[PDB]
Symmetry: C2
Subunit: 258 residues, 2 copies
């Protein structure tokens, strides 16, 4: 399970200020902590988008060798950021809109980057796992067309808050399982984990419980809170239960430090 | 998720003593504590099994209206225990072996009781999920043959410790998923949850991680630590995530007190 650390996002006030002030310290500090949590990737979200992404990339990769996950709907910004990246990167994201696909799929191929794909077009987030499924298939077909390796496509079936859209959660579990049972080579799957618990009580609880359930349906990656030690515990334990990682008594520690 | 409290077992010292000494005090209080945790059924294991079981029954239902889960391979103990039951109980258990099937299914029907069937025969635990399944279909057939209501049959795919039997854990996860694919309407499923962590570090974490995972794979009930508040939390939470229980703020409280 790949944990993509969520915290370097402009929607958080300290990051918005750091970016505005062009003060790299809060950014670099969140970079170490997330990594130290056990994240093996860093989500980067400006919250001049192109320049801000650039600074985010440079400032962050100056203290961290983690895979950088460029999080923006401005494709200019991702591209600029893609250019600044010292190592392989992830793009977050494209959806199933052909206009996006023809741009971001090749874009990803140019830079040897991973690509996250939302099971949706511009119509809106689908109400069921069938409609989701059908968007994930286009994503897959898009990969083959543009020669993006299937293991480099991360499909996001889009989880929704448990309080207002409770009926979506099992529908998302179902799509994951359907994608899991795709023929070799199969694509990967990722979630925007924290959204499952948006305005709910005991968010960390909900977050980690869905993490475990989604991994059983083959979840490969999660944008999430890397400084939630209990979430990280879940991540490492789930790996063991799926016989993805060899047991030892210190499995938690091995995950955090591997 | 039906939590079957594991505590009233003769493997534990205090129950071992309270039995022989025929003191119900330790038994009754554990019955109280388990229910307090949220257990809605109660395993009763002896550790004269027959008079003992009978004792466990009478003593326990002196304080609990909770379903009694009579835990023994001594059919007379079971039979002798059913008869003393004030409420509907559950038989723990039968395997796929004819000699047992022939006996334990009519038994459970006679007393209007649920039945737990292990997906094995006398030889041993099966390796894969497809061998467990076969025993599973066999169990489904007998429920029909002997007129046991399918929702009264709880099939146990038999989970093993993760440090010594890691490859079995995903196997049980698939068996759980497929088993729902076996009939309409389907039988229920059950786990001896705590067996997954038998001699591992941080057993609770492992136990409850697997619970969530198994529940995503349709797990209906589990014999486990009802006094494990984190376990109970996970049960409560996973129900919500599957849209089995209507969301609400104090959803943990609601699972405990409903």
């Amino acid at each position: 399970m790949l944990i993509i650390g969520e915290r370097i996002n402009g929607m958080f006030g300290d990051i918005k200020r750091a970016i505005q002030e062009r003060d790299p310290a809060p950014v670099q500090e969140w970079a170490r902590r997330q990594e130290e949590g056990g994240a093996r990737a860093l989500d980067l979200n400006v919250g001049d988008k192109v320049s801000a992404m650039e600074w985010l990339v440079e400032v962050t990769q100056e203290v961290s060798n983690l895979t950088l996950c460029l999080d923006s709907t401005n494709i200019k910004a991702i591209e600029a950021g893609l250019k600044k990246c010292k190592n392989r990167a992830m793009i977050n994201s494209t959806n199933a809109e052909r206009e996006k696909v023809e741009k971001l799929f090749p874009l990803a191929v140019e830079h040897g980057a991973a690509l996250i794909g939302l099971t949706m077009n511009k119509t809106g987030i689908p109400k069921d796992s069938d409609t989701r499924l059908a968007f994930a298939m286009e994503l897959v077909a898009a990969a083959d067309e543009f020669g993006l390796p299937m293991e480099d496509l991360y499909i996001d079936p889009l989880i929704l808050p448990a309080n207002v859209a409770q009926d979506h959660a099992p529908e998302v579990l179902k799509t994951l399982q359907q994608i899991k049972m795709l023929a070799d080579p199969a694509p990967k799957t990722v979630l925007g984990l924290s959204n499952v618990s948006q305005n709910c009580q005991n968010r960390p609880l909900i977050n980690r419980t869905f993490l475990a359930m989604a991994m059983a349906c083959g979840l490969m990656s999660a944008i999430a809170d890397a400084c939630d030690e209990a979430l990280i515990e879940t991540a490492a334990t789930a790996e063991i239960l799926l016989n993805q990682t060899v047991y030892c008594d210190s499995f938690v520690k091995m995950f955090k430090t591997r």
